[PDB]
Design a protein around this motif. Sequence first.
Motif, PDB file in Angstrom:
ATOM      1  N   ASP A  39     -14.654  -3.487  15.913  1.00 25.29           N
ATOM      2  CA  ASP A  39     -14.947  -3.020  14.563  1.00 25.29           C
ATOM      3  C   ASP A  39     -15.138  -4.183  13.596  1.00 25.29           C
ATOM      4  O   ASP A  39     -16.014  -4.142  12.737  1.00 25.29           O
ATOM      5  CB  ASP A  39     -13.842  -2.096  14.033  1.00 25.29           C
ATOM      6  CG  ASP A  39     -13.787  -0.754  14.761  1.00 25.29           C
ATOM      7  OD1 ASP A  39     -14.753  -0.398  15.473  1.00 25.29           O
ATOM      8  OD2 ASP A  39     -12.764  -0.047  14.611  1.00 25.29           O
ATOM      9  N   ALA A  40     -14.310  -5.214  13.733  1.00 30.17           N
ATOM     10  CA  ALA A  40     -14.408  -6.390  12.858  1.00 30.17           C
ATOM     11  C   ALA A  40     -15.687  -7.190  13.126  1.00 30.17           C
ATOM     12  O   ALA A  40     -16.280  -7.788  12.220  1.00 30.17           O
ATOM     13  CB  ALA A  40     -13.180  -7.268  13.023  1.00 30.17           C
ATOM     14  N   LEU A  41     -16.093  -7.216  14.387  1.00 35.97           N
ATOM     15  CA  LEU A  41     -17.330  -7.871  14.774  1.00 35.97           C
ATOM     16  C   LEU A  41     -18.513  -7.079  14.233  1.00 35.97           C
ATOM     17  O   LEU A  41     -19.486  -7.671  13.757  1.00 35.97           O
ATOM     18  CB  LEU A  41     -17.415  -8.013  16.297  1.00 35.97           C
ATOM     19  CG  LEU A  41     -16.443  -9.063  16.855  1.00 35.97           C
ATOM     20  CD1 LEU A  41     -16.167  -8.813  18.340  1.00 35.97           C
ATOM     21  CD2 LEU A  41     -16.987 -10.481  16.631  1.00 35.97           C
TER      22      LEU A  41
ATOM     23  N   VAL B 133      -8.490 -12.805  20.742  1.00 39.75           N
ATOM     24  CA  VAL B 133      -9.207 -13.529  19.695  1.00 39.75           C
ATOM     25  C   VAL B 133     -10.574 -12.929  19.464  1.00 39.75           C
ATOM     26  O   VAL B 133     -11.315 -12.687  20.413  1.00 39.75           O
ATOM     27  CB  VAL B 133      -9.437 -14.999  20.063  1.00 39.75           C
ATOM     28  CG1 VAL B 133     -10.016 -15.746  18.858  1.00 39.75           C
ATOM     29  CG2 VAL B 133      -8.144 -15.650  20.523  1.00 39.75           C
ATOM     30  N   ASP B 134     -10.931 -12.691  18.208  1.00 40.78           N
ATOM     31  CA  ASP B 134     -12.307 -12.302  17.925  1.00 40.78           C
ATOM     32  C   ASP B 134     -12.913 -13.158  16.823  1.00 40.78           C
ATOM     33  O   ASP B 134     -12.197 -13.826  16.074  1.00 40.78           O
ATOM     34  CB  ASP B 134     -12.438 -10.807  17.597  1.00 40.78           C
ATOM     35  CG  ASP B 134     -11.761 -10.421  16.283  1.00 40.78           C
ATOM     36  OD1 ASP B 134     -12.190 -10.915  15.217  1.00 40.78           O
ATOM     37  OD2 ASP B 134     -10.809  -9.607  16.319  1.00 40.78           O
ATOM     38  N   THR B 135     -14.238 -13.146  16.755  1.00 42.73           N
ATOM     39  CA  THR B 135     -14.956 -13.873  15.715  1.00 42.73           C
ATOM     40  C   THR B 135     -15.562 -12.873  14.730  1.00 42.73           C
ATOM     41  O   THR B 135     -16.680 -13.037  14.248  1.00 42.73           O
ATOM     42  CB  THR B 135     -16.025 -14.794  16.325  1.00 42.73           C
ATOM     43  OG1 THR B 135     -16.814 -14.049  17.257  1.00 42.73           O
ATOM     44  CG2 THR B 135     -15.353 -15.949  17.058  1.00 42.73           C
TER      45      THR B 135
ATOM     46  N   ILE C  77     -15.128 -10.380  11.111  1.00 42.94           N
ATOM     47  CA  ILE C  77     -15.208 -10.690   9.687  1.00 42.94           C
ATOM     48  C   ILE C  77     -13.950 -11.372   9.125  1.00 42.94           C
ATOM     49  O   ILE C  77     -14.019 -12.088   8.126  1.00 42.94           O
ATOM     50  CB  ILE C  77     -15.575  -9.424   8.869  1.00 42.94           C
ATOM     51  CG1 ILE C  77     -15.938  -9.805   7.432  1.00 42.94           C
ATOM     52  CG2 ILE C  77     -14.447  -8.393   8.932  1.00 42.94           C
ATOM     53  CD1 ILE C  77     -16.797  -8.778   6.749  1.00 42.94           C
ATOM     54  N   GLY C  78     -12.813 -11.182   9.782  1.00 41.26           N
ATOM     55  CA  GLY C  78     -11.572 -11.763   9.309  1.00 41.26           C
ATOM     56  C   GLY C  78     -10.990 -11.010   8.123  1.00 41.26           C
ATOM     57  O   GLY C  78     -11.629 -10.123   7.560  1.00 41.26           O
ATOM     58  N   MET C  79      -9.774 -11.373   7.743  1.00 41.57           N
ATOM     59  CA  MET C  79      -9.074 -10.678   6.671  1.00 41.57           C
ATOM     60  C   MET C  79      -8.657 -11.645   5.585  1.00 41.57           C
ATOM     61  O   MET C  79      -8.341 -12.802   5.866  1.00 41.57           O
ATOM     62  CB  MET C  79      -7.824 -10.004   7.229  1.00 41.57           C
ATOM     63  CG  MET C  79      -8.088  -8.772   8.058  1.00 41.57           C
ATOM     64  SD  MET C  79      -6.557  -8.084   8.737  1.00 41.57           S
ATOM     65  CE  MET C  79      -6.212  -9.289  10.017  1.00 41.57           C
TER      66      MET C  79
ATOM     67  N   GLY D  51     -12.589 -15.100  11.797  1.00 41.30           N
ATOM     68  CA  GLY D  51     -12.176 -14.026  12.687  1.00 41.30           C
ATOM     69  C   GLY D  51     -10.680 -13.822  12.696  1.00 41.30           C
ATOM     70  O   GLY D  51      -9.967 -14.238  11.774  1.00 41.30           O
ATOM     71  N   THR D  52     -10.201 -13.168  13.749  1.00 47.17           N
ATOM     72  CA  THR D  52      -8.799 -12.793  13.829  1.00 47.17           C
ATOM     73  C   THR D  52      -8.251 -13.054  15.216  1.00 47.17           C
ATOM     74  O   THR D  52      -8.931 -12.814  16.219  1.00 47.17           O
ATOM     75  CB  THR D  52      -8.631 -11.307  13.424  1.00 47.17           C
ATOM     76  OG1 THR D  52      -9.064 -11.161  12.063  1.00 47.17           O
ATOM     77  CG2 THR D  52      -7.179 -10.843  13.552  1.00 47.17           C
ATOM     78  N   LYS D  53      -7.036 -13.590  15.253  1.00 46.14           N
ATOM     79  CA  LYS D  53      -6.309 -13.828  16.497  1.00 46.14           C
ATOM     80  C   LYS D  53      -5.007 -13.026  16.462  1.00 46.14           C
ATOM     81  O   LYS D  53      -4.213 -13.194  15.537  1.00 46.14           O
ATOM     82  CB  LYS D  53      -5.988 -15.323  16.572  1.00 46.14           C
ATOM     83  CG  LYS D  53      -5.125 -15.756  17.728  1.00 46.14           C
ATOM     84  CD  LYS D  53      -4.901 -17.263  17.682  1.00 46.14           C
ATOM     85  CE  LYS D  53      -6.209 -18.019  17.525  1.00 46.14           C
ATOM     86  NZ  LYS D  53      -5.981 -19.497  17.562  1.00 46.14           N
TER      87      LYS D  53
HETATM   88  C1  LIG Z   1      -4.477  -6.687  13.009  1.00 47.68           C
HETATM   89  C2  LIG Z   1      -5.456  -5.600  13.386  1.00 47.68           C
HETATM   90  C3  LIG Z   1      -5.399  -4.434  12.436  1.00 47.68           C
HETATM   91  C4  LIG Z   1      -6.821  -6.212  13.590  1.00 47.68           C
HETATM   92  C5  LIG Z   1      -7.600  -6.496  12.482  1.00 47.68           C
HETATM   93  C6  LIG Z   1      -8.809  -7.169  12.641  1.00 47.68           C
HETATM   94  C7  LIG Z   1      -9.630  -7.416  11.404  1.00 47.68           C
HETATM   95  C8  LIG Z   1      -9.837  -6.449  10.325  1.00 47.68           C
HETATM   96  C9  LIG Z   1     -10.667  -7.184   9.404  1.00 47.68           C
HETATM   97  N1  LIG Z   1     -11.169  -6.698   8.151  1.00 47.68           N
HETATM   98  O1  LIG Z   1     -10.865  -8.371   9.913  1.00 47.68           O
HETATM   99  N2  LIG Z   1     -10.276  -8.536  11.065  1.00 47.68           N
HETATM  100  C10 LIG Z   1      -9.247  -7.569  13.905  1.00 47.68           C
HETATM  101  O2  LIG Z   1     -10.409  -8.295  14.061  1.00 47.68           O
HETATM  102  C11 LIG Z   1      -8.457  -7.290  15.019  1.00 47.68           C
HETATM  103  C12 LIG Z   1      -7.237  -6.618  14.852  1.00 47.68           C
HETATM  104  O3  LIG Z   1      -6.482  -6.292  15.959  1.00 47.68           O
END
Ligand SMILES: CC(C)c1cc(-c2cc(N)on2)c(O)cc1O
Length: 207
Positions: A38-40, A76-78, A80-82, A167-169
């Motif tokens: 979803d973030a990607l 790990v994903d690349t 949009i990040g938070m 992104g998010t790890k």
């Molecule tokens: C921590 C959990 C909910 C989660 C959030 C994001 C995320 C959400 C946004 N807006 O950016 N990154 C993600 O990529 C992976 C995740 O497992």
Amino acid sequence: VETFAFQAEIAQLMSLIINTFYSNKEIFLRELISNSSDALDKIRYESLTDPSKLDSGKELHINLIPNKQDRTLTIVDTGIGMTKADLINNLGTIAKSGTKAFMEALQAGADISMIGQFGVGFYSAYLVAEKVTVITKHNDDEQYAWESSAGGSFTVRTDTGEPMGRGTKVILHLKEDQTEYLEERRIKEIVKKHSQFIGYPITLFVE
Ligand SMILES: CC(C)c1cc(-c2cc(N)on2)c(O)cc1O
């Protein structure tokens, strides 16, 4: 380091996940991969009108990294990040209302595996992890680390670790009896079973 209390509903959800007898724990990985997808999707969509949003990394993918020495599984994903605000606000989810709906569903007979349909799939991490660390980097904001061992609170701090680009790890510090999720064949089996059709490359690292 700033320490925050979870909203009551989220603390309740976490306690339920931690304390309810439920053998089908493997669903945590499907939920995290789904969140990454979803973030990607989000950064991909934003890039369609502003290609420079990918200056922080053009490749859109997911890495699964087991580490038997640290007893961690990292996703790990690349995407949009938070932002910091997102992290504090239940990691960019509608967790308060989602938790309510999940509860209402569990009463209507549903089971824990349906958790993702209510936007709170992330918390299923606590089926297998004693502590979860989330490192994240959104364009034009700094890199932050969120962390929680449940028990009603989480911390947020600026991350001084390895720069991520974007992104998010999610780092899962596994429970002592959940180390099967570090085994290559077990991770492969789970990914093939539940995440076969995710639209981004998923790379399972070896040790
Ligand atoms: C921590 C959990 C909910 C989660 C959030 C994001 C995320 C959400 C946004 N807006 O950016 N990154 C993600 O990529 C992976 C995740 O497992």
